[PDB]
Design a protein around this ligand. Structure first.
Ligand SMILES: N#CNc1nc2ccccc2[nH]1
Ligand SMILES: N#CNc1nc2ccccc2[nH]1
Ligand SMILES: N#CNc1nc2ccccc2[nH]1
Ligand code: NI
Length: 341
């Protein structure tokens, strides 16, 4: 049954709560983004209203086959009334279609639910700049100071330069990129763009990416693998055995593979700067792990929260252990005492 931190008090609303059957009192189910832990439970048989972005709605219809009558897309940055309550969707700087939700409760309380997000100073000039937020439901994925990583821009610079150098030295090299969900599309699109190639992939992944309704992405994708020198594969295949096996299938077109595994944070970020990163190599196959995050660093999160000055914080990630909960609560108090709210 549905946990407390997925319920919006004083409303009939839940957020990212599709795996609990019918939720008692829920008149509308919000979905922040199309990632499996959040949508878990949705299908063609779902018969309650779903509120989400246009992009999330495209994915619900085409990938999970939710019936069109139950899909309620809302535009971003626009005041909307849902079951007698004013709501706003804001871009979360996470994966495509991902939103934060502002709820204006009838009693005068204002609640921000971040969904999953990567906090940025640009959010300090959204529709958030006006008004007070009483409660914040916060993506606390990396809420500890050990979690550091580069900007997305620096990581893409490293990837483009690495790929361009390798293929300029060896015109017969293949670039492979790993994927298990939507998000992080810039990695493979930026590499294909510098190499003058389209990105080749399965029919299933092409369809998933087609549901994002964006011409720029559409010009750079294909299902014709043979005509492409940047290939996408499932993340589980990005290992020496899986890549060896893939290389056999290309029919003596290539004699080297350079592969990228976009991860989140890993312990190596404690030690090694992005510019100094080196691959794992076996024979004619090299694999780079690159720290491309779509969640806030500790410092990004702290800056956002200290700016917003919420009266109460409810974490939505790392909620299962007393150690985690106690650590997060200590940081929230430090931030409050330093900033004076
Ligand atoms: N909206 C949205 N997501 C989005 N749009 C893109 C355009 C180019 C490359 C990656 C992209 N991701
Ligand atoms: N001759 C020549 N160019 C060339 N071929 C390579 C294959 C693998 C790695 C580096 C290489 N450079
Ligand atoms: N302070 C702190 N960390 C912490 N608090 C706990 C409470 C119960 C079990 C493990 C725990 N770890
Ligand atoms: Ni997510």
């Amino acid at each position: 049954t549905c946990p407390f931190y997925k319920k919006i008090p004083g409303t009939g609303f839940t957020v990212d709560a599709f795996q609990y059957g019918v939720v008692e009192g829920c008149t509308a189910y919000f979905l922040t983004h199309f990632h499996s832990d959040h949508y878990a439970g949705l299908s063609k048989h779902f018969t309650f209203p779903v509120y989400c972005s246009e992009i999330t709605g495209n994915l619900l219809k085409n990938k999970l086959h939710v019936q069109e009558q139950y899909i309620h897309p809302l535009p971003l940055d626009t005041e909307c009334i849902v079951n007698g309550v004013k709501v706003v969707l804001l871009d979360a700087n996470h994966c495509p279609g991902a939103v934060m939700i502002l709820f204006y409760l009838p009693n005068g309380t204002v609640i921000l639910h971040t969904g999953d997000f990567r906090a940025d100073p640009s959010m300090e000039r959204s529709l958030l700049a006006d008004q007070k937020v009483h409660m914040l439901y916060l993506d606390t994925t990396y809420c500890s100071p050990e979690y550091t990583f580069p900007s997305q821009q620096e990581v893409i610079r490293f990837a483009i330069n690495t790929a361009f150098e390798a293929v300029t030295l060896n015109p017969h090299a293949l670039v492979v990129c790993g994927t298990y969900s939507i998000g992080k599309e810039k990695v493979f699109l930026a590499i294909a763009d510098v190499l003058g190639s389209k990105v080749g992939m399965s029919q299933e992944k092409y369809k998933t990416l087609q549901c994002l309704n964006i011409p720029e992405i559409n010009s750079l994708i294909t299902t014709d693998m043979c005509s492409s020198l940047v290939h996408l594969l499932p993340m589980m295949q990005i290992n020496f055995k899986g890549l060896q096996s893939h290389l056999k299938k290309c029919g003596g077109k290539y004699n080297q593979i350079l592969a990228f595994r976009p991860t989140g944070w890993t312990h190596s970020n404690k030690f090694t700067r992005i510019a100094d990163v080196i691959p794992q190599t076996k024979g004619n196959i090299s694999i780079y792990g690159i720290p491309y995050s779509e969640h806030s660093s500790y410092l990004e999160m702290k800056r956002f929260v200290q700016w917003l000055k919420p009266q109460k914080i409810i974490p939505t990630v790392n909620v299962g252990t007393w150690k985690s909960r106690s650590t997060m609560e200590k940081y929230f108090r430090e931030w409050k005492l330093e900033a004076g709210y």
